[PDB]
Each structure stands twice: as C-alpha cells, then as structure tokens.
Coordinates of C-alpha atoms in Angstrom, one line a residue:
X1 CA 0.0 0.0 0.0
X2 CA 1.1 3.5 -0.9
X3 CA 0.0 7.6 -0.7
X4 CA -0.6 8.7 -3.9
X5 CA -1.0 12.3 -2.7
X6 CA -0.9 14.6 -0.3
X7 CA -2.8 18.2 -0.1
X8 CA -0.7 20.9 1.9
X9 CA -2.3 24.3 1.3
X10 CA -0.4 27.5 2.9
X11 CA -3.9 29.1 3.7
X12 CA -5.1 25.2 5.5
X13 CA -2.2 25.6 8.2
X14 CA -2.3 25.9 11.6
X15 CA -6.1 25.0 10.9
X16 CA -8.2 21.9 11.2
X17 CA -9.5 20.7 7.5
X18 CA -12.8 19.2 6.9
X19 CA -12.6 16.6 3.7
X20 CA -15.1 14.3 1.9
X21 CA -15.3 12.1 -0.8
X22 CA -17.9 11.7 -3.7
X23 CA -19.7 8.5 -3.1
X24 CA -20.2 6.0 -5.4
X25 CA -17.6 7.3 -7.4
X26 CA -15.3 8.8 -5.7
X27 CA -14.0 10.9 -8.7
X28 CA -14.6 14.5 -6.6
X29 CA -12.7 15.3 -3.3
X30 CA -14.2 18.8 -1.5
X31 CA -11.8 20.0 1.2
X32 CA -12.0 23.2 3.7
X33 CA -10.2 24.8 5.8
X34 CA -10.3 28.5 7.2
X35 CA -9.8 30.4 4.2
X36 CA -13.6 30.1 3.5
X37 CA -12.5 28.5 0.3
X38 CA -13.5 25.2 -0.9
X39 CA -11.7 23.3 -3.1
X40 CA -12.8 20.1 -5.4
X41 CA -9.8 17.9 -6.2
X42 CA -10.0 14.6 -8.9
X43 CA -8.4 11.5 -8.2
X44 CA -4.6 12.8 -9.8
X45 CA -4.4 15.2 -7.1
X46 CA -5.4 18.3 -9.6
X47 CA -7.9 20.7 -8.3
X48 CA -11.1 20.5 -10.3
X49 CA -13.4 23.0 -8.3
X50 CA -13.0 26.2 -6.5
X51 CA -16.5 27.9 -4.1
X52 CA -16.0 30.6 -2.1
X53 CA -17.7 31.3 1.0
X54 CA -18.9 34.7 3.5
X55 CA -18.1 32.7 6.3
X56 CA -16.1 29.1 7.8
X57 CA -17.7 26.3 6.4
X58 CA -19.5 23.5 8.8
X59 CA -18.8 19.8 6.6
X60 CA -19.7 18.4 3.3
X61 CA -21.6 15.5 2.2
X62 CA -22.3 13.1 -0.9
X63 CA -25.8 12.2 -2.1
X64 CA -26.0 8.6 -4.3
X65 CA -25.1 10.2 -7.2
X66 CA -22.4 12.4 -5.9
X67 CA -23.0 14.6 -8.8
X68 CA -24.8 17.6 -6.8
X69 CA -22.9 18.6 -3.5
X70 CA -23.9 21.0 -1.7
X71 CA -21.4 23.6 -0.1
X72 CA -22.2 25.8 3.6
X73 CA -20.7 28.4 5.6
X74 CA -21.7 29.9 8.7
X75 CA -23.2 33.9 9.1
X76 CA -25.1 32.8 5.9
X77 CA -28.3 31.8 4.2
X78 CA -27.5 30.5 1.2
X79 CA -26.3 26.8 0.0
X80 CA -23.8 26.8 -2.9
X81 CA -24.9 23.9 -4.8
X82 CA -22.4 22.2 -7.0
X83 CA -22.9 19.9 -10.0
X84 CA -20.3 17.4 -10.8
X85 CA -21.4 16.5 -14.4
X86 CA -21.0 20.0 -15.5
X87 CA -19.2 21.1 -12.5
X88 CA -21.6 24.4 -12.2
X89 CA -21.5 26.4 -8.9
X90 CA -25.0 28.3 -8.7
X91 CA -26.6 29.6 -5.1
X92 CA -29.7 28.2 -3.1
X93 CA -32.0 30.6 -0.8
X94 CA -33.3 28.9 1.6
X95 CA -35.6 32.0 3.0
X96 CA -35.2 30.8 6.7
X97 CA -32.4 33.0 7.1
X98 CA -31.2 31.4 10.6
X99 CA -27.9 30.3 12.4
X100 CA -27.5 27.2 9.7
X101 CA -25.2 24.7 11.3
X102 CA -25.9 20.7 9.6
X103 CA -26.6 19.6 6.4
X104 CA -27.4 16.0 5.3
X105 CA -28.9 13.9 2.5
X106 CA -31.2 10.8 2.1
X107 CA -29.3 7.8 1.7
X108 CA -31.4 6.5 -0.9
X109 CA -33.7 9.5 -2.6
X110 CA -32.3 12.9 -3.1
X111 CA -33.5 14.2 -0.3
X112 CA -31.3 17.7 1.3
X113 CA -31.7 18.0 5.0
X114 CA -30.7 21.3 6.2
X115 CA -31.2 22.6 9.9
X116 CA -30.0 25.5 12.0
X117 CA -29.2 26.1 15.8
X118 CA -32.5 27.5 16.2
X119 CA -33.8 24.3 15.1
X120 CA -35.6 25.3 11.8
X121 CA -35.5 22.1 9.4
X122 CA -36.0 22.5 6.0
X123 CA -36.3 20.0 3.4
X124 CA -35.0 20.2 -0.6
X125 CA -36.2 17.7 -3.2
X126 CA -34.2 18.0 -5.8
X127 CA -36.1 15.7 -8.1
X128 CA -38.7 18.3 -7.8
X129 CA -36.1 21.2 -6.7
X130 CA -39.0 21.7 -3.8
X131 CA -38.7 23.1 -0.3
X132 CA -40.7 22.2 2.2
X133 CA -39.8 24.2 6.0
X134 CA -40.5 22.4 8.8
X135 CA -40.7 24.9 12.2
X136 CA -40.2 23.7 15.4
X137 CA -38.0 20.6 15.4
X138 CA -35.6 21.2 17.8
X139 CA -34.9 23.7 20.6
X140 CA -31.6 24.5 20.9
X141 CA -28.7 23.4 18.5
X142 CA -28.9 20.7 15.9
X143 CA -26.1 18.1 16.1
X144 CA -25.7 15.5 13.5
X145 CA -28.3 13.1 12.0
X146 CA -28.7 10.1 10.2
X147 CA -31.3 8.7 7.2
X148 CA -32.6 5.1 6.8
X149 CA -33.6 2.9 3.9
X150 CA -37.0 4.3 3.8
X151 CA -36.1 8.0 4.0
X152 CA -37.0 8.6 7.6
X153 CA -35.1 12.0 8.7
X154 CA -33.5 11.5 12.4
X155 CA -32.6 14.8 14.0
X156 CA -30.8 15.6 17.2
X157 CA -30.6 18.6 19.1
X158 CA -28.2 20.2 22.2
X159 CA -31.6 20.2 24.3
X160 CA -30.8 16.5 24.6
X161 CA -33.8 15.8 22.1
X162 CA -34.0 13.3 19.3
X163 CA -36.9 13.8 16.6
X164 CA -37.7 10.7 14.0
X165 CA -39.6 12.1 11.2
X166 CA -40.6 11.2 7.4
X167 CA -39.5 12.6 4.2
X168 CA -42.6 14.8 4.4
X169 CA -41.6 16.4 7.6
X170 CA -44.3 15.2 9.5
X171 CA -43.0 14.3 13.0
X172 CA -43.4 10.8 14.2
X173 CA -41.3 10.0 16.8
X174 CA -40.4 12.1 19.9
X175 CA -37.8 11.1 22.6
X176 CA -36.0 12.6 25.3
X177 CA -31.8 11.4 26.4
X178 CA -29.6 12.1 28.9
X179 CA -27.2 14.1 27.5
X180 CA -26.3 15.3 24.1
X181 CA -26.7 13.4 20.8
X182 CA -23.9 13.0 18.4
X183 CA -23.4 10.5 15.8
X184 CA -26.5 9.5 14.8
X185 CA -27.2 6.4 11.8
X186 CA -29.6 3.9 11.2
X187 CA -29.2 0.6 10.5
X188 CA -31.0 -2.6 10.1
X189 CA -31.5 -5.0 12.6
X190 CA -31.5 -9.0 11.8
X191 CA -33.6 -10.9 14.0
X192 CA -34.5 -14.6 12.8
X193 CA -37.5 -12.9 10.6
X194 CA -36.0 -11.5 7.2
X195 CA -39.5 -10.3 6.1
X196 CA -38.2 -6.9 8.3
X197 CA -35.7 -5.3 5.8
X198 CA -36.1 -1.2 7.2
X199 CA -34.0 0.6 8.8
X200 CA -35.5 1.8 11.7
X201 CA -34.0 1.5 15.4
X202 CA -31.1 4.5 15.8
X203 CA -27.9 4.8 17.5
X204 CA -26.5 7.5 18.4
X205 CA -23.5 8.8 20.9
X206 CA -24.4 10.4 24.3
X207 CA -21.8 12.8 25.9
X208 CA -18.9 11.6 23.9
X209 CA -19.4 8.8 26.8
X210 CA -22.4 6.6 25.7
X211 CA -24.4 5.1 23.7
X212 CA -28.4 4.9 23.5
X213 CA -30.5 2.8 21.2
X214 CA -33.9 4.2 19.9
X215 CA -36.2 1.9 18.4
X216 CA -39.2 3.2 16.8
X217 CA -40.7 -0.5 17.2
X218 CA -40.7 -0.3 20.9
X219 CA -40.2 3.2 22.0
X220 CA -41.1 2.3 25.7
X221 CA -37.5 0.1 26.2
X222 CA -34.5 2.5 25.0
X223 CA -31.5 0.7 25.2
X224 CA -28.4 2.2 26.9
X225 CA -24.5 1.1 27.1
X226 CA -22.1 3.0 29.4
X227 CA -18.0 2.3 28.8
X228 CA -15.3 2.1 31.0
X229 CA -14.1 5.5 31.8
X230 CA -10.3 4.7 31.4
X231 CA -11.3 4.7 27.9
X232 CA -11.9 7.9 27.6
X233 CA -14.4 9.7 25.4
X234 CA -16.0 8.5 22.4
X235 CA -14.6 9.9 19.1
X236 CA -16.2 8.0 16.4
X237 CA -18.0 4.8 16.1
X238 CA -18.5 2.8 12.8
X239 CA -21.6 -0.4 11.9
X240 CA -20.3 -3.9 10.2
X241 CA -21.3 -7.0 10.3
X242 CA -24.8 -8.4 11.4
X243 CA -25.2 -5.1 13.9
X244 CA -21.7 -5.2 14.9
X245 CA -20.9 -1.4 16.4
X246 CA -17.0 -1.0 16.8
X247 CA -16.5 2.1 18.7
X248 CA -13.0 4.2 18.8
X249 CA -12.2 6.1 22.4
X250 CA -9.2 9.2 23.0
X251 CA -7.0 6.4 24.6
X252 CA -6.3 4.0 21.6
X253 CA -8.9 1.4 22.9
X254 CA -11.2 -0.1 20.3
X255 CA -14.4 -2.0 21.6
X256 CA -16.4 -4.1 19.2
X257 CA -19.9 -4.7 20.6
X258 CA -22.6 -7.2 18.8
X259 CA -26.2 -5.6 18.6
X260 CA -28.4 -8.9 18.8
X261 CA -31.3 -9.7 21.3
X262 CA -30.1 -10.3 24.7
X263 CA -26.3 -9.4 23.5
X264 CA -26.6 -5.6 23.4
X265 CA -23.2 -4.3 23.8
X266 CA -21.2 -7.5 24.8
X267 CA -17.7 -6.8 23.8
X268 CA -16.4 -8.8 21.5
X269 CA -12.3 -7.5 21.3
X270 CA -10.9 -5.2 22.6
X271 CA -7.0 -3.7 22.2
X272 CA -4.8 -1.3 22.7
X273 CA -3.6 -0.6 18.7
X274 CA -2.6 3.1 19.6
X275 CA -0.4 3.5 22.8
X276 CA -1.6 7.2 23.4
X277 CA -4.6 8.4 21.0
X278 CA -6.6 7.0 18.5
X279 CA -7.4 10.1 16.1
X280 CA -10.6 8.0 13.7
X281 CA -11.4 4.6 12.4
X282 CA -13.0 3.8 9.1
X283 CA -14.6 0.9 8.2
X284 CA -14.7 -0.5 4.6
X285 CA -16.8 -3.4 4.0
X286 CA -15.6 -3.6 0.2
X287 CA -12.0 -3.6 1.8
X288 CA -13.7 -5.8 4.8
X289 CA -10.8 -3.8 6.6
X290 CA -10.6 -1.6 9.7
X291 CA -8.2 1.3 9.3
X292 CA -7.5 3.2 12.7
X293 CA -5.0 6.2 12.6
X294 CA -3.6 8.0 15.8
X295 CA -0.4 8.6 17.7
X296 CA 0.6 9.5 14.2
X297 CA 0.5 6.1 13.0
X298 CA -1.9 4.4 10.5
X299 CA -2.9 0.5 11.5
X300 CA -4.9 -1.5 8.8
X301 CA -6.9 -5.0 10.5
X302 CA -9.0 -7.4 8.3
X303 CA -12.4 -7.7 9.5
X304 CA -12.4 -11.2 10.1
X305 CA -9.5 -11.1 12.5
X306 CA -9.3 -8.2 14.0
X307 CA -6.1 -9.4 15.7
X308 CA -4.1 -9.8 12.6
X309 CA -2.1 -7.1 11.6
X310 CA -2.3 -6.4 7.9
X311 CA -0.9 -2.7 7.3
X312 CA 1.2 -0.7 9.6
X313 CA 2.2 2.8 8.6
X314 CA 4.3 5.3 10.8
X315 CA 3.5 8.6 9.7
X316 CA 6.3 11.6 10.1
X317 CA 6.8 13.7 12.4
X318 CA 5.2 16.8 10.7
X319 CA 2.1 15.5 10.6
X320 CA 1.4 15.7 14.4
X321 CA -2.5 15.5 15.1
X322 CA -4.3 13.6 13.0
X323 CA -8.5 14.2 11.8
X324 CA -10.8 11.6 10.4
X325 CA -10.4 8.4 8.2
X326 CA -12.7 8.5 5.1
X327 CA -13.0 5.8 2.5
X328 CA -14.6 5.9 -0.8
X329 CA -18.0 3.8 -1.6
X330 CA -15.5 1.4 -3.4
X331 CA -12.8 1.2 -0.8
X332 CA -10.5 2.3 -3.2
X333 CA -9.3 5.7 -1.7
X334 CA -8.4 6.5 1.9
X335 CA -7.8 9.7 2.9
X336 CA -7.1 11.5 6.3
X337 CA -6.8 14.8 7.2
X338 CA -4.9 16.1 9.9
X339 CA -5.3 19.3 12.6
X340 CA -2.9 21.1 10.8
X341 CA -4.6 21.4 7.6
X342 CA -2.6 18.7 5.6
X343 CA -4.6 16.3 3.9
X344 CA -3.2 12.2 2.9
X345 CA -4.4 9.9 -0.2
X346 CA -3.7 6.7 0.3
X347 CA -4.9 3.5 -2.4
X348 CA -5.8 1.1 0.0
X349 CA -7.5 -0.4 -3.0
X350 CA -6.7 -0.7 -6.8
X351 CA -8.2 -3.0 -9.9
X352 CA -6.2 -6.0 -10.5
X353 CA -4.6 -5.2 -14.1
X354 CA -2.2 -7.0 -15.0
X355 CA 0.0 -8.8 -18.4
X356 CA 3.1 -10.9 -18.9
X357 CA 4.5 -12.1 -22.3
X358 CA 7.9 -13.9 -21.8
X359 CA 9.2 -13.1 -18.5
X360 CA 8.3 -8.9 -19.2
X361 CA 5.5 -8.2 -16.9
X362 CA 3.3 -5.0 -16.7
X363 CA 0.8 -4.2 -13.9
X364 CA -1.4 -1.5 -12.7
X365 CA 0.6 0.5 -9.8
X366 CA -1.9 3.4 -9.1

C-alpha cells in the first residue's frame, strides 16, 4: 500500500480541514479549511473546483449520485450547490435565514436536509427542486443526524432531544436522552425474521461517553450502554457486520460490541492498537478492513481477524495530530486529514490489471 498524494495548502495551516469524498464514485474530493474557500480535487491530485464562502464552512456530504454537492458556511443563508457532471457552482435561498449549522442527505432518494441552531428544518427535493420548511423541530442546536432505507429523517438537538420524522416532515417519533446526541445512523437490525428489511432503530453517541438505542418498534424500552471510563471519550464509532458497532475512544482502545437480542453491547475485542490516541477509524466493508490512525500512525486490520495485523504505517513527524479516516464507496481511496490542515491519499485499494508475455511483466501500480 502506498500515498498517492498529499494536499498541503499555505492558507489550510495551523487549521483543522474538513474533507469528503464523492460517493459512489469517488471521482470528486471537496476540502475546507479557514480560508472560507472550498476546493474540489479529482483522483490525480489536480484541483477541479474552487467555491467561495462569506463565512467558515460547517462539513460536506455526498448524495447517491455524488454529482450535486452541496457547499455551507456559517453567518449565511445561502447553500452553494455544486454539479459534478457540469461542474456548475450556482446559489440556493433557503428564506429561513437562521444560524445554519448541519446539512445532510437521504441515503437512498435525493433528499437535502438542512437545519440551523434555532432548530428550523427545511427539506429540498431536488427531483422536484422543492422546499418544504419544517418549524419547530428542535430547541436548541442541531447536532448531527442520520437517514434510513426508507427516507426517515433523524434529527438531534443540544436540548438533549432526538426527533424521527418522514420525508414529508411530518414528526413521528419524539424522545428525550440524557445528554447530548452525536453521531446519529440507522441501520438494520437481523432478527431470525428477514421479512423486516427497514432501517429503523437509531444509535446515536451520548456525551462523547455513551451510547443509547432508539427503536421506533418499541419506544417504551430504549437501550443504553455505558463504557469504562479509562477509555476515555467516544470519538467516532462505525456499523459492520450483522449489527456489529465498533466504537473508537481518546485512549487508543477499540471496543467491538454485537447488537443482537439479549447481547446488546457484549464486547467482542478489545485492544490497545494506539499506545496514546486513537485520532478516527473507518470501516470499509468492500476492503472488509478496519483502518484506525492515531499517535501519528496508521494501522490497517482485516475484519475477520481483527487481531491480525495487515498494514502498519508510521507517519512523520510533521504530521502531528491527526482528523478523520474516510474511504470511498469502493474502498478504493483513503484519505485522512490532519489538525494542521494537511490532507493524505492513500490507495488502499486498486483493480487487478495485469500482463506478462515472456518473463516482461506489466501491472497497474496506481
């Protein structure tokens, strides 16, 4: 395994970067920092994209497509919608006019979900280019969200509030927690029925510390797991498997925890792979490979045995603090960005070409 590239911008230093991928394709990289410029690089390494901003952008996100991406910034109203197959940068008004702090899409239709930190929610179809503003959804500041198989928006707000709605913005589902969201996905569960293939039951990160289980099926029983606190606190958690959670902590301690009835949050292994601090962990199930960076060193496990080591990478010295881990929908691309503003590309992942006449061989390097 080998970098293919790595993005070091004069403007990005001394600053934390915010970096994602095109899904399903992976042919578009959009990266911020605090320039309130936002770049679109190819797969070479080339920029391909430039939008500029009034204010520091928030985080980016892919729909199925990947073609239309949608670009924020805070102290502003406006989305800067970007299209991929023409790669056309034209401006969105929402008319809401609030503190806008998350943006996510459907993970099936193209669906936009936009909230603020007054807790205005506004929907965008695009198939329809239609907006439909839904008032009232949270009290105090959105924090992440998540979308099933069905389009159900989940939405969770710093008033330790979770709302489970429908595309339509009707609310159906309203539930109180401890303390405050983070992290929210959906995810299907696997019982011995199969004739249940919807997303519905959330999980979602409580005070960095832990976790709570919302199932719209049974609303009455919320599940809730509590780690040891030598662990530290919760930095990102990732789903594989049949309802397998593995969950990263500040200390370098991975815990993988199994999701069926009557085993909710049994560990299954647990190690110390970074001595000091684990910085992400991604989770490729084309790869079927665990990649966890931190203490400025890179470890790649196979999924079936987490215990074996497969790829260790020691990364240099300039590159102290690390951000997240983000594969492509393929596995092919990893890249990780790092609080200094420096962005990696490593190919985890590459087609097999390959041709040999006589003993002259040629293969496909990157």
């Amino acid at each position: 395994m080998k970098r293919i590239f790595s993005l070091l911008e004069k403007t990005w230093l001394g600053a934390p970067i915010q970096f994602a991928w095109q899904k399903t394709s992976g042919n578009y990289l959009a990266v911020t920092g605090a320039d309130y410029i936002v770049k679109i690089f190819d797969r070479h390494g080339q920029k391909r994209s430039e939008i500029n901003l009034p204010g520091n952008c928030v985080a980016m996100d892919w729909d199925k497509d990947g073609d239309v991406l949608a670009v924020i910034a805070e102290k502003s109203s406006c989305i800067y919608l970007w299209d991929a197959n023409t790669n056309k940068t034209s401006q969105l008004d929402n008319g809401m006019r609030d503190q806008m702090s998350f943006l996510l899409w459907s993970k099936v239709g193209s669906f936009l979900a936009v909230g603020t930190v007054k807790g205005n929610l506004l929907i965008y179809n695009h198939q329809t280019s239609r907006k439909i503003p839904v008032l009232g959804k949270h009290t105090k500041r959105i924090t992440c969200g998540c979308w099933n198989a069905e389009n159900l928006l989940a939405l969770g707000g710093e008033d330790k509030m979770i709302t489970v709605s429908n595309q339509e913005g009707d609310t159906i589902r309203q539930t109180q927690v401890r303390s405050e969201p983070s992290n929210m996905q959906f995810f299907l569960m696997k019982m011995d029925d199969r004739t249940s293939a919807a997303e519905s039951m959330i999980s979602v990160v409580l005070g960095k510390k832990t976790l709570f289980f919302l199932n719209l099926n049974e609303p009455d029983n919320p599940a809730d797991l509590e780690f040891q606190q030598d662990f530290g606190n919760i930095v990102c958690y990732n789903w594989y498997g049949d309802g397998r959670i593995m969950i990263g902590f500040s200390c370098g301690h991975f815990v993988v925890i199994s999701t069926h009835t009557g085993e909710l949050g049994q560990e299954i292994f647990q190690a110390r792979n970074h001595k000091d601090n684990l910085t992400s962990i991604a989770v490729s199930q084309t790869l079927n490979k665990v990649a966890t960076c931190g203490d400025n060193c890179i470890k790649i496990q196979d999924l079936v045995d987490l215990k074996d080591m497969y790829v260790i990478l020691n990364l240099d010295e300039e590159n102290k603090g690390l951000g997240t881990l983000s594969w492509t929908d393929d596995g092919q691309l990893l890249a990780l960005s790092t609080q200094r503003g420096s962005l990696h590309v490593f190919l985890t992942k590459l087609p097999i070409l390959g041709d040999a006449c006589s003993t002259r061989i040629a293969y496909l390097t990157s």
